[model samples]
Each structure stands twice: as C-alpha cells, then as structure tokens.
Target: GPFCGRARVHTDFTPSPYDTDSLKIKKGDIIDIICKTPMGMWTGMLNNKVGNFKFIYVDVISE
Candidate 1:
C-alpha cells in the first residue's frame, strides 16, 4: 500500500487537538491533514495511500 512506503514529516509539524493519533506515521514523514471546514471531514494519507477511520474521542484518561 502507499502508506507502507516511508517518508519524513516536516520540521514544523504541529499536531492538532483533533488528531487522536496518527497511525503508521514514520519518522521524517510529512503529514498535512487539513480539515476543509469546522464541520468538514479530513483525509488521512500515508505515503500517498489513504484510509479512513472515525475520530477517537478522549474525554477521560486514566494513568
């Protein structure tokens, strides 16, 4: 799959609060997941391969 390939993320990577977790993201992989609008959906692509998953809500945490 395209996501299987390896890539590097930009140094100015800023994680969004909406990002529950970035799966399969390897070191040096550049990720640009922009939400189209406040209620719009975002696409997740890895190495040009794409996949969709429901957002993970973290309302409570226990550590």
Candidate 2:
C-alpha cells in the first residue's frame, strides 16, 4: 500500500522514543511527517511484511 500507519508529532499521545520536542510547538504551527512502508516486490506486496516510521516534520520543530 502507498500508506502506512498515521504519523503524528511527538506529543504526549505519541511520545518520542528519543527526546521531548513537542513543548516548542506553538499554536497554529503545522507539522507533517512522512510515514512509509518499504517499496515492495510488487504493488500487491506493498503492505505485506512492511514496517513503518516517522521522520521529523521540518515545518514545526525538531530536537
């Protein structure tokens, strides 16, 4: 599949495994993360045995 799990800011609801950066996010700030599964052997395998990840949203913040 072209989509994986939902990506979100490292909030209390989605605490980062590394550090805290959510405090720096100001109101109305917009953030977007690319959540992806690996390119597969074929489209039929897009979602098969794939893992997901979230990269930092450059617009909002990082730490």
Candidate 3:
C-alpha cells in the first residue's frame, strides 16, 4: 500500500526477538504509516526503519 498516515508515539515500544516485523518507537516519535492492520496494528516507518506498531502505543496525528 501507499503512505497511510502519520502518528505520534505516546510510549516506548520494545520488540522481542520473535517480533521481527515490529518497530521500536520512543515517546514523542513520529511513525509514517504504510498501512493499518486488522489487529489494531499499523505498518509504518520510524527514522528510517520499517515495521508494525500498535495503536495503543501511539496516537494518530494525521491521515
């Protein structure tokens, strides 16, 4: 999919080794969403890294 939207990280996100598709986000960071998923998770990029993140860890700032 194309660029979805942008969100703000509200809390720190640390992924386990098994969470190979998840992105690590810190508080006050910006997530450039590629697309949102069904399980309340969204695929996005942070800095220059791409991965999936959860809505609970972030707040939507743009669409």
Candidate 4:
C-alpha cells in the first residue's frame, strides 16, 4: 500500500522481533508508517531506520 499518517511512540521499544535489525524508538518520537498488518504489527521508518514494530506502543496521528 501507500504511506499512512504519522504515529507517535507511546513507550520505549527494544528487543524487537528482528533483534539487531530492530528500530529503536523512544517515547514521543514521531514515525512514518509505510504499512501495517492485521495482526497489529506496523512496518515504518524512523530516523533512517525501517522495520516492523508492535502497534500497541504507538498512537496513530491523523493528518
């Protein structure tokens, strides 16, 4: 699909499923979501990093 709206980090996320490939995000960081899965995982880019993160730790921001 296309790019979605911005999402704000609600909490610290580490130890991602991809291990070292994870996108380390701090609370209140804004990210761009490229796509999302029905299972609540979101693939996005943040500070030049791209990876999948749990949706539970982010809040979607409406444009």
Please say which candidate is ahead in TM-score: 3 or 4.
Answer: 4
lDDT of 2 by residue, 1-63 (tens): 254333333432233567443223323333333343243211111122222223342222442
lDDT of each: 0.36, 0.30, 0.81, 0.81
Error of 1 at 4 (Å): 24
- If scored against the real structure, what TM-score would every candidate get? 0.26, 0.19, 0.77, 0.78
State the local distance difference test value for candidate 3.
0.81
For model 3, the superposed segments whose C-alpha errors exceed 4 Å read 1-4
> How much does each candidate deviate from the true structure in C-alpha RMSD?
13.6, 12.9, 3.3, 3.2
lDDT by residue for model 1 over 33-58, one digit each (tens)? 42322342234565675533222211
List the candidate 2 regions with Cα displacement exceeding 4 Å: 1-23, 36-63
Task: Flag regions of model 1 displaced more than 4 Å.
Answer: 1-22, 36-43, 52-63
Taking the tens digit of each residue's C-alpha lDDT, what string does model 4 give over 1-63? 444889888978877476875677778888898988787788889878898887888888876
| Top-down TM-score ranking | 4, 3, 1, 2
* TM-score-superior candidate, 2 or 3: 3
Q: Which stretches of model 4 miss by more than 4 angstroms?
A: 1-3, 16-18
